Amino acid sequence: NPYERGPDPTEDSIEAIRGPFSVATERVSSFASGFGGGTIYYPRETDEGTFGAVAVAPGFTASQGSMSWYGERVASQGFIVFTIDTNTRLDQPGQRGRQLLAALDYLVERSDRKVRERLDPNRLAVMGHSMGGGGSLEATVMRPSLKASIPLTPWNLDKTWGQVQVPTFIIGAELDTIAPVRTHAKPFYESLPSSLPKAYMELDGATHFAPNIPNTTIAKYVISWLKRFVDEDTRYSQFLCPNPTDRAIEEYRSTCPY
């Protein structure tokens, strides 16, 4: 597998705050067409080859600051990470899905050459918090060629996602009162096809804002999910299959094995 990057993982390496790659950033102006700009995090070393990318959307009334900590933590594992702002803070999930796609198109078509020369434009993923998690879902129905989708405590009025054909990893917060897992996260998960590579992880005790705070349980499995499906890196299957059972996890569902 020529998409493999970094040394073989271990239980400890997927929990590391700082991965094997050193990280740099490129700021993207608010004036970009199709989304509210953002920050591109990328691996600095080029000697292992190019990397896939993930665009990351904030939630309703939130800004890219709520999603900042994913930038270095994930990019240092060998990914290009793009934490974006939305056109307005009040944009709905659908718009966020569109804007996630414009952010990835920007990476591919117009980003600085330091980014573009490190990029594999065919290996792309979406991730989002809350309404941005809804956006992550929306994005995959808009662009089925995406490699992965990670909706974080997602929020969406549309509860059926039977048409999704992108490997989807949904993360819920047990006590989430803004996007209750019973009417968002779990209906979304159980609606994805049983034949789709997919997963639900519910964080014990967590509230809606758990994804905005550095969380080793979130990070380790977000990284595994992106490695396994953006890189097709089966070295990371061990952490995804069978169901992880960390003390921090209230519940986990999956269609293992992939």
Residue number with the smallest Cβ distance to Cl ion: 208
Cα angle: 75, vertex 76, 78; to 5 degrees: 70
Q: Is 188 annotated as a binding residue?
A: no
Closest distance of CB 59 from Cl ion, Å: 12
- For Cl ion, give the closer residue by CB, 78 or 211: 211
Which is nearest to 25 in space by CA: 118, 124, 89?
118
Q: Is 105 annotated as a binding residue?
A: no
- For Cl ion, give the closer residue by CB, 207 or 238: 207
Q: Is 232 annotated as a binding residue?
A: no
Q: How far apart (Å, rounded) are the C-alpha atoms in residues 252 and 203?
A: 9
Q: How far apart (Å, rounded) are the C-alpha atoms in residues 179 and 97?
A: 18
Q: Is 72 annotated as a binding residue?
A: yes
Q: Is 4 annotated as a binding residue?
A: yes
Q: Is 32 annotated as a binding residue?
A: yes
The contact set with Cl ion (CB under 5 A) reads: 176-178, 207-208
Two tokens at 33?
A: 């067409």
Give the ranges where 81-180 is alpha helix by DSSP (H): 93-109, 113-116, 131-142
Closest distance of CB 134 from Cl ion, Å: 16
Closest distance of CB 257 from Cl ion, Å: 33
Taking residue 5's Cβ as centre, other Cβ atoms within 10 Å add up to: 20
Active site residue 130: yes
Closest distance of CB 187 from Cl ion, Å: 18
Q: Which residues contact 195 (CB under 8 A, 6 or more apart)?
A: 255
- For Cl ion, give the closer residue by CB, 186 or 227: 186
Q: In this structure, is the dihedral angle defined by the CA atoms of residues 232, 235, 238 and 240, taken in order, positive or negative?
A: negative
Which member of 66, 76, 130, 149 is catalytic? Answer: 130
| Contact call for residues 258 and 241 (beta carbons, < 8 A) | yes
Active site residue 208: yes
- If DSSP codes are grouped into helix, strand and coil, which group holds residue 125? strand
- For Cl ion, give the closer residue by CB, 137 or 210: 210
Which is nearest to 137 in space by CA: 119, 108, 157, 118?
157
- For Cl ion, give the closer residue by CB, 39 or 153: 153
Closest distance of CB 178 from Cl ion, Å: 5
Instruction: Please report the DSSP string for 28-44 in residue order.
Output: E-TTSTTS--EEEEEES
Which member of 208, 224, 231, 254 is catalytic? Answer: 208
The binding site for Zn(2+) consists of 4, 11, 47-48, 72, 138, 158, 160, 174, 202, 204, 250-251
Q: Which residues are the active-site residues?
A: 130, 176, 208
- Please state the residue numbers annotated as binding site: 4, 11, 30, 32, 35, 47-48, 72, 138, 158, 160, 174, 202, 204, 250-252
Residues placed in the known binding site for Ca(2+): 30, 32, 35, 158, 160, 174, 204, 250, 252
